[PDB]
Every structure is written in structure tokens, then in C-alpha cells.
Design a protein around this ligand. Structure first.
Ligand SMILES: C=C(C)[C@H]1CC[C@@]2(C)CCC[C@@H](C)[N@H+]2C1
Ligand SMILES: C=C(C)[C@H]1CC[C@@]2(C)CCC[C@@H](C)[N@H+]2C1
Ligand SMILES: [Mg+2]
Ligand SMILES: [Mg+2]
Ligand SMILES: [Mg+2]
Ligand SMILES: [Mg+2]
Ligand SMILES: [Mg+2]
Ligand SMILES: [Mg+2]
Lengths: 304, 304
């Protein structure tokens, strides 16, 4: 698979190695891994590396929070593949009041106290910015087990849904939190079109590289939890071509979204609407897109 | 618009210059043009040139029939843009019994006697093969005013419909007639996957180059007859990109359809199923795809 040229250059957080050891070490200590093979596969994925590629300009004392949140969501994402839609929904909904801090965790259940302690530590560091990540996370969690995954979709309908399932909103709120980048409601309304365009890029790039993994999962895991819901399959069905053909076409489309991003940002600046905060924000989104692609094309999570 | 690499070599019928002069001259004499500007535009389109690119291995004494048929259908196709679905249907339905030769033409009405004399001349040359073009033509004509054009369509649904509106079947029967290429029902049923794949290529290549023409038509012509119905607009809406971006992505998809064509052809002969007639047929379909692209790139019908 040869990716067409891109002008987006990825950047990684300088503290990636020490934060990786810290976060991986925490989960290896607390998370209920079934066996040693799973523990090695967990480390091999590099969940803190993708986080550091996603938010390379996060504050040095906040990047670990982002690594912890994405890591635990990665782990849960894999667990849901062996559950039904109903079981996955019950699993996630249990964690939601716990994430809010409204409900105390069962200390004998790792996922509950990991989730609880995480959000408590994040609110302790920055209460206002931490709270603004909550609902975007819950929107993503509920999209994971939405029964729309088992119903016919076109490319457009998928991308609209996948924006929630890919967690575009939580990644944006997490990025702002990790950078301490505060934007007014008016400023955020200005970049909504830019956010929507960025979401499609993150979604499809993931779909492309994670297709083989998800193909295998669809055949081996739960028929609902592991259902093959991806742009690769959808375009392949609409055009009646192979998944490999669909990947090549989708990758060209991703470059068109990169072009649109630059066009939208350029217009924002020309209209005199790009505040210093917005300028940092849109650059952060580009890091997400380039960082997502670098990690996806190199991580062992997708190659083995 | 830089076309992606293709391995197809477009061929043109050697008698293109003589037949173009003959057929253009016929329509300039008989067809009712609004003004001199329209007569220039008609010649500028080169309707016999695309026919010779579509069927480069047509028999020397049969190529002119195909040129006449496609030319009159091109002219009718433009006329229907200023009619409603109801009016357009009425226009086409009147030509159907005339095409069969069941009803005499009004010789004061050019379109009626041109259609009548043409089909009569075609049946006089080869009655059996001429008759086999009838139903594929009527199928195309009735697709032109299908009410589904006024309903939102996905990419898959469009391509399924467009196979009739693009006149895939009529082009196939016309090609066989022009080459005197007879196929058995078994041979015809055998290559239906190849036909469906070829149809998508013809359709999208046309959509790509005729988009600007049809965008303008949608703004100026009848609200029904001029309605914008194309894969370019569909992909642009679903992926939320410009029409130009959608063109570039669709063009890559066309090349994937070219790859599938070669794959399906190779599989036909890998299985014990490629007859001499089928080999000439599927090769003829390649000429249609490459010829349609070559003409669409250069014709003034699309560039102005
Ligand atoms: C596009 C990405 C990085 C996805 C990967 C899978 C995962 C479940 C990882 C944790 C975050 C959620 C939104 N989601 C992001
Ligand atoms: C893709 C082509 C060549 C179309 C162009 C428009 C037209 C009405 C021209 C005459 C033949 C019909 C099928 N149809 C073919
Ligand atoms: Mg998931
Ligand atoms: Mg997953
Ligand atoms: Mg994936
Ligand atoms: Mg038409
Ligand atoms: Mg037309
Ligand atoms: Mg067209």
C-alpha cells in the first residue's frame, strides 16, 4: 500500500518515551490482562506513542493524562468486539456515571477504578477543561454500540456516524485540555467546518490501515461487536471493487480532505477570523491527522 | 484535470473522416437547428468521431449506421433537458413504434422520419441484428425520464440506474451489429459481470467530463429535465468536497474498474469459457471505455 504524497509533516511529543513507560507500566500493573502474550501485544501497540503523535504540543505535565485516557479506551474498544451490542452498551453505560464521579467504582474491578481515578486526577489538575471532555467521550462510547452499525449505510451516512465512533470531538477536547488551549464558544463555532473535515480524514486513514485487523475480527469475534463497519467495505460494495481497490481510492480522497483543510484555514485567516488560539488549534488538528497516519502505518496493532 | 495512468490503447475507425462528413452532412440537411450557432456547435461536438472511437472495429459498410443512431440520440438527449419528465416521456414514447417500423413517420417532423428511415435501413442490411438493438434502445430512452432522477441516490443506487441511462445495453448491441458479431445466449449471460463493470466506467468517465455542462443546464433548463444527476455531485455531497476533488477521486476509481475488467477477462479464459466471439466482445468493450475517455477529453461539447 503506497500512500499518495502529503504536505502534512508529523510531530511527536518529546517526552514520548518516559510517558510511555509510565502509562504502559500503570496499565500493566492494574489492568486485567489474560496472559503474557496479551501483555506483550499491548506494549507492542504503542498506545502512548499515538497519543504523543496526536498531541505533540501538549503541556509536559498533562500529556500523561491524555495517554491514560486513550489507552484505556483502546483496551475497552478491543473488549467490545467479543460482546453483543447490548453487552457492550451495558459495559460502557456503567462507566459513564463513574467517569462523571457521580458513582464510586468497584475497587475489585480494574476498569472501574482506573476510569474513576483518571477523571478525578484530570479534574484536580484542570476542572473546567476536564469536564468539557466528558460528554464528547460519552457520545463516542454510545456510538460504539449503536445498532446503526448493523444496518445499510452509504459513504456519506457512514462518515456522519463515524465522526462519533472515531471520537473526533473527544480528541479535540482532549487536545485542548492537554495543551491548556482555551477557546470561546464563538471561536469553536468558527472552526466547525474544519472539525467536520478533519474527522473524515482521521476516520478513513484508520479504516484503511486497520481493515485487515477488522476483517479478521469480523470472522472470529462476536458477530455484532466485531461487525465489519468501515469505509473500506462500504466503498468496495458501492463500486463493486476489491477492498484493496477501495483503499487506494480512499487514500486519494484523504489527500483531498487535506487540501480542503488548508483551503478552509486560509479563508479563516483571510477573513481576519483566525485568532492566536484558533491558529494553534487548527495546527493541532493537522498534527492529529499526520500523527494518526504515521502511527497507523507503523504500529504492530495493524500490521500483525 | 490530469488523468491517472491507463494501460488501455484507444482505437479509432479508419473511415472516421469520410463517415463524419457523410453523417454530419445528413443531419445538417434534415435536422431542425435553431440557428447557425447551433449548427456549428453540432459539428464541433464530433458525434461520428466518438462513434468511431466506440466501435473502431466495426465493418466498413455498417459503421455509418451506428454514427447516425448515436447522433440522433445525442440530439434528443439535449432536447429532453428543456422538457418535464412527462413531456420527455411523451416525446420518446412516440418514437418507439416508429423505431419498430410499426408506425409511419410525419415527414414534416425531422426526428420522426430520421428515426424511421434509419431503423428501416438497418433492418434492410441486417434484420436479425438490427432487431436486437430495439429493446436495449427503448430501455435507455425510458430511463432518461425515470422518476428516480428526482429522488436522492447513493453511489451504488446511481450506478445501477445509470447503466440504463448511459445506454450500456444499446451500445453493446450496436457494437455487435456494427461488427456483425453474433453471440449465443450462453455467451451473453457469461459476460454479465464484465458488462456491469464496463458500464460504471463509461458512466463515471462521462460524469467527470460532462459535469460543468450539466451544472449549467441544471441552473438554466427545465426543473426536471435539467436536474443534476451525476456521480460527481453525489460523491461531492457524501464526502463534502468540491466537484473538482470528486472528479480526481472518481478517476482513480475508473482505473480500478479497468483493472477489474482485465481481471474478469483473464478469469473468463482461465475458466474454460472464453470463446472467439467473447474474446472479440470483451476487447470491443475496452475500446468503448478508452474511446469514450479519449473523446470526452477533447470534445467541445464538454469543454465549452
Ligand atoms: C482514530 C483513533 C486514534 C481511534 C482509535 C481507537 C480508539 C478507540 C482509541 C481511543 C480513542 C477512541 C476515540 N478511538 C480513537
Ligand atoms: C456515455 C455516452 C457516450 C452517452 C452520451 C449521451 C448519449 C445520449 C449519446 C447517444 C447514446 C446514448 C447511450 N448516450 C451515450
Ligand atoms: Mg472501535
Ligand atoms: Mg476497534
Ligand atoms: Mg479501525
Ligand atoms: Mg442524458
Ligand atoms: Mg445529457
Ligand atoms: Mg453526462
Amino acid at each position: 500500500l503506497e500512500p499518495p504524497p502529503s504536505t502534512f509533516q508529523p510531530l511527536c511529543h518529546p517526552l514520548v518515551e518516559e510517558v510511555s513507560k509510565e502509562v504502559d507500566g500503570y496499565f500493566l500493573q492494574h489492568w486485567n490482562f489474560p496472559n503474557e502474550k496479551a501483555r506483550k501485544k499491548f506494549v507492542a501497540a504503542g498506545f502512548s506513542r499515538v497519543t504523543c503523535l496526536y498531541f505533540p504540543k501538549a503541556l509536559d505535565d498533562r500529556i500523561h493524562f491524555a495517554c491514560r485516557l486513550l489507552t484505556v479506551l483502546f483496551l475497552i474498544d478491543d473488549l467490545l468486539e467479543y460482546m453483543s451490542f447490548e453487552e457492550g452498551s451495558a459495559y460502557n453505560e456503567k462507566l459513564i456515571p463513574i467517569s462523571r464521579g457521580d458513582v464510586l467504582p468497584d475497587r475489585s474491578i480494574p476498569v472501574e477504578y482506573i476510569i474513576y481515578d483518571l477523571w478525578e486526577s484530570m479534574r484536580a489538575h484542570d476542572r473546567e477543561m476536564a469536564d468539557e471532555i466528558l460528554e464528547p467521550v460519552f457520545l463516542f462510547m454510545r456510538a460504539q454500540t449503536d445498532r446503526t452499525r448493523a444496518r445499510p449505510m452509504g459513504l456519506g451516512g457512514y462518515l456522519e456516524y463515524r465522526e462519533r465512533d472515531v471520537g473526533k470531538e473527544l480528541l479535540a477536547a482532549l487536545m485542548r485540555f492537554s495543551m491548556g488551549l482555551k477557546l470561546s464558544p464563538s471561536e469553536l463555532q468558527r472552526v466547525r467546518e474544519i472539525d467536520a473535515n478533519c474527522s473524515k480524514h482521521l476516520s478513513v486513514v484508520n479504516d484503511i490501515y486497520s481493515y485487515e485487523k477488522e476483517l479478521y475480527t469480523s470472522k472470529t469475534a462476536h458477530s455484532e461487536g466485531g461487525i465489519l463497519c468501515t469505509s473500506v467495505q462500504i466503498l468496495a460494495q458501492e463500486a463493486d471493487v476489491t477492498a484493496e481497490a477501495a483503499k487506494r481510492v480512499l487514500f486519494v480522497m484523504c489527500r483531498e480532505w487535506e487540501l480542503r483543510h488548508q483551503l478552509l484555514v486560509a479563508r479563516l485567516s483571510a477573513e481576519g477570523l483566525e485568532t492566536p488560539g484558533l491558529a494553534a488549534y487548527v495546527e493541532g488538528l493537522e498534527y492529529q491527522m499526520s500523527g494518526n497516519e504515521l502511527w497507523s502505518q507503523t504500529t504492530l496493532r495493524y500490521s500483525v
